[PDB]
Amino acid sequence: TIRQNYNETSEAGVNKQINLELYASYTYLSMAFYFDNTTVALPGAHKYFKKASDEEREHAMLLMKFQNQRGGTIVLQDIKKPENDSWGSLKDAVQAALALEKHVNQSLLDLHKLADSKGDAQMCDWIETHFLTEQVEAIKELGDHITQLTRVGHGLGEYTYDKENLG
Amino acid sequence: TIRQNYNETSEAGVNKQINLELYASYTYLSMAFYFDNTTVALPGAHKYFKKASDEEREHAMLLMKFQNQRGGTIVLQDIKKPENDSWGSLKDAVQAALALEKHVNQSLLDLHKLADSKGDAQMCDWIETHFLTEQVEAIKELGDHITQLTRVGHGLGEYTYDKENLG
Amino acid sequence: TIRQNYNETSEAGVNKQINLELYASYTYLSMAFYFDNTTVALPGAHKYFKKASDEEREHAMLLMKFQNQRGGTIVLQDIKKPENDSWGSLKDAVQAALALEKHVNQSLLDLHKLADSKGDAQMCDWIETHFLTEQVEAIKELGDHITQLTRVGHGLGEYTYDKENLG
Amino acid sequence: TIRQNYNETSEAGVNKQINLELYASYTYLSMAFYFDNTTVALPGAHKYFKKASDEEREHAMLLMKFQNQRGGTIVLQDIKKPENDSWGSLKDAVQAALALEKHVNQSLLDLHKLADSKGDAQMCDWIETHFLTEQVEAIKELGDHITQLTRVGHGLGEYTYDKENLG
Amino acid sequence: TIRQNYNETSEAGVNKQINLELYASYTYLSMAFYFDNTTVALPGAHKYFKKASDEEREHAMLLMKFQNQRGGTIVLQDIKKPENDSWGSLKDAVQAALALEKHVNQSLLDLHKLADSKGDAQMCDWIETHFLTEQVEAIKELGDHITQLTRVGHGLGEYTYDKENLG
Amino acid sequence: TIRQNYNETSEAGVNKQINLELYASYTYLSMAFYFDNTTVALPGAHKYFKKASDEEREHAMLLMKFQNQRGGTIVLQDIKKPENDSWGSLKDAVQAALALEKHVNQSLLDLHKLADSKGDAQMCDWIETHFLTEQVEAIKELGDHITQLTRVGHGLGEYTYDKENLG
Amino acid sequence: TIRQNYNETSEAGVNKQINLELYASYTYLSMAFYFDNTTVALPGAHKYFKKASDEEREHAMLLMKFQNQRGGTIVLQDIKKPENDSWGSLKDAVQAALALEKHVNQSLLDLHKLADSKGDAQMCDWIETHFLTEQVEAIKELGDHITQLTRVGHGLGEYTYDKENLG
């Protein structure tokens, strides 16, 4: 009785975006506690990736909120474990996060294209409002970090950027 | 001299959306004073529908504001009286309002589709920004009310939800 | 079971004074946004007639609350559109509103005479408290406005009085 | 070089209590948004189970911080989806959570017994400080909730207890 | 490594929008100091066009910010001098600014159409969010000024609107 | 359905602990009001033992809250009148309290050894957290008062230590 | 007469622990003022190790207070001069500190075991509360310091970590 102009493949897409967000929350959680391991001991990346872990959880809840708003049905799936147990250098992890956000960005743009093909005017604006530009700004930020992590180099530079920039 | 990329059927659509909003303001006004009748005596729905009556008036003024912004001409028509003189149970009225907002939602989505076909980029975003998601959230809210009004049932439950939720 | 000394004919007059108030509100809303149109562009008039639209909408709602309080039943009719689509000069519009308020005063006086004949002291005093003096002042204000608008003439004076007096 | 009196089997129990906590968090997130669905529409339950989702997610992270502090290595597994897609009545859901917390208490007690057998006083006291009493209270709270939900019955009472007690 | 779904003709369009904004900043700067010439001595238009000069500079920087966000390359060109060295009456200059903003509005709508044809979902929303409605409201405002500058007429009227409205 | 890892013996032992703190509370009240008697008239000792009476009462209430929290059943017994109807000198009653608290301490340690023997890890930590260390601080306090009340002697010593240290 | 459940060997062990905690403060005091030597001139390390020395002297007084509370007897031995008059680099001193903390941790765990095997439930919990988890926190912290000291390297890095992290 509330569902209106809400295509069933869109509802499917929304249910798949939820898992991808939760999967990205779990990767940043792994990364965050990787930098908390004594042998890595980078507390600034810890802080930086715990916050990314929190925010990607919020994104998943926004989609579940969205799924209920439009009259859809939320269906959850296993949250896959992250592709690695350790994440290398600070620069390595940022690199791995850039690739994660680009992949999430394509799913969001495909989800938008799908919704657009089915005439879902509110769903498109909704994805634009809550996701399309945050993704762009998240990706620009990781790129910047990577350039800067290259410039400062390993060793003291890595300590510094971790402390004075991340967190 | 200001009109730019503003199709004349769009201007017509905007003029018809104005009347539909004013017609919905008038229905919620009828509903609001129906609950003020001693034989109904639901002061919380009174408050809830007076506020919906005010907000649907504001929507109509936003469109008139919009009509003048884009270079169009506002043409007003008779505001039809509401389809009923009394509105039944609290649950009945919410049900009648859900159906009103769904109908308004389709007109807004058709108005958007029309504007889109004529390339009106600003008009589309404008409808999305001011209407498409407020409609979605208004519809989700009425649905929720209806589920809750079913759960509490008639009698004391109806008194309670009126007092402790509506207004 | 609350109706007392409330005559059926008085109930009908209230019902029709309600529709009359909604109609003056619609007329002022029309004038308000006529002055928002770029080809007119008198911002003060726009604010002046928009708040007059809000006020005669509140008159209608008082009459509606009164109808209920005394134990009548509200019956709404269509609100006919305004007279005109455009309202000419600032002075033409104030003169048009004067005529409107003037007609509105007469049916209030008619409603008062009707109630007196039915021995309805409370309805008579209610009408004097909320309407009869507040119309006398509105009519005096408009007469003042017309004179002043006549004094300052067209062009620079119309802008001046619109900016410095209305709103 | 910081590991001390930390047994490999205890490290494995922590790793699996981590995954267990993430799993209870996912289950509660599932219940939280089941109550946000319009066909259910219990706002209090939604806030109650969303904050319980946040909490058992923090349990997982404590265990993660502990694993690192004592010199183990974190190993994450997939978080299996919840049991069910819908959770029935408010009382069904609290009973389901009771069973869940109940299972979670047992493996904490198992983890405690395991650690005791390895002579691991610090890990035992850590588990008592952060988990063992905080589970006893959670289980008592849920038992209380079930009784109360049993007392107020279906319909108006479920709404009442959802509004006035959960959240 | 950050560029994603960012068409190279879009990047070209963005680089051309930058120059058009800077060109409009420079015209309003000329206009602003024209009204500062003793022989014109309109200090309110001075203030009004210095602020428009500042804001059109900001628009150009938003696009450069945009160009770097999406992974593009900023390429600057000569900022052409304004089409006139003097700008006539206050009404003449506003008229010249209306025509400037309408031209800028078409470039923005063409830039949007281009981006839309290449599927750039984020770029479209971005142009809508930062430009499409500010343009509409800037154009409605200049039109209004022009109507009012006609009404007040030359001489004292021109002094007044300059002082009491512009700035 | 909330009971877990809570042995039937422990529960019996909690019930008699309940009775033994209530017995202590009442012994301490009798002491307190003995020192309020005009023939004794030590206002410090009255305050001191009325306070300890309240604390042992709170202990008994903590123990009843724990019985409920772990899923047992409170079973109350008669509260036996205290050992004496009068308590001699100030040092005498402090000495009776030391004996009493050592009896309560040894009961708590047996209740702990019982609970340990059944693997009730939460019970053990609860007794450590609220009882075992408070008993040892109390006993040190009592031993300290006796040494001092020995050092100050009878007469003006007793009076002084009553007024300046106890209460 | 206050000694209850306090074994002869538990007491000898607190006395040995008092001396051990006194030995740590002396070593850390020695570390502290080495980093104050002109040929060393690390002010962070001095601040940081002066604090370590204070803390370990707090720990010694806690045990001295415990021995008195349980009715044992404090017996003091000489406080041996530290192993080294000089401590090398910052990372060398921190590594020495991690070794002493693991040693001190072991005899605490040893002391905890001795008391367990005598059934001293209070003494065990007392060591958990004031010592075992503090030791794990200190050992983890020291670890992190060695990893970061390796990462920042010699020279500027050693200076940087000393200023920006230690004190």
Numbering used by the authors:
A (entry chain C), B (entry chain C), C (entry chain D), D (entry chain D), E (entry chain C), F (entry chain H), ...: 3 to 169
Excerpt from the paper describing this PDB structure:
Ferritin is the main iron storage protein in most living organisms, playing a key role in iron homeostasis and detoxification. Canonical ferritin is composed of 24 subunits, which self-assemble into a quasi-spherical nanocage with an outer diameter of ~12 nm and an interior diameter of ~8 nm. Ferritin has prominent octahedral 4-3-2 symmetry, and each ferritin molecule contains 24 C3–C4 interfaces, 12 C2 interfaces, 8 C3 interfaces, and 6 C4 interfaces, which provide several potential pathways for metal ions and small organic molecules to diffuse into its inner cavity.
To elucidate the detailed structure of the 3D protein arrays, the high-quality cubic crystals of P156HAfFer were obtained, and subsequently, its crystal structure was solved at a resolution of 2.50 Å. As expected, the introduced histidine residues formed two pairs of π–π interactions between two neighboring P156HAfFer molecules. Additionally, two pairs of electrostatic attractions were formed by Lys93 and Asp94’ between adjacent ferritin molecules. Although such electrostatic attraction is also involved in the formation of the SC superlattices, the designed His-involved π–π interactions play a dominant role because wild-type AfFer cannot assemble into such SC superlattices. Additionally, in their SC crystals, the C4 rotation axes of adjacent P156HAfFer cages are not aligned perfectly, while the P156FAfFer molecules are perfectly aligned.
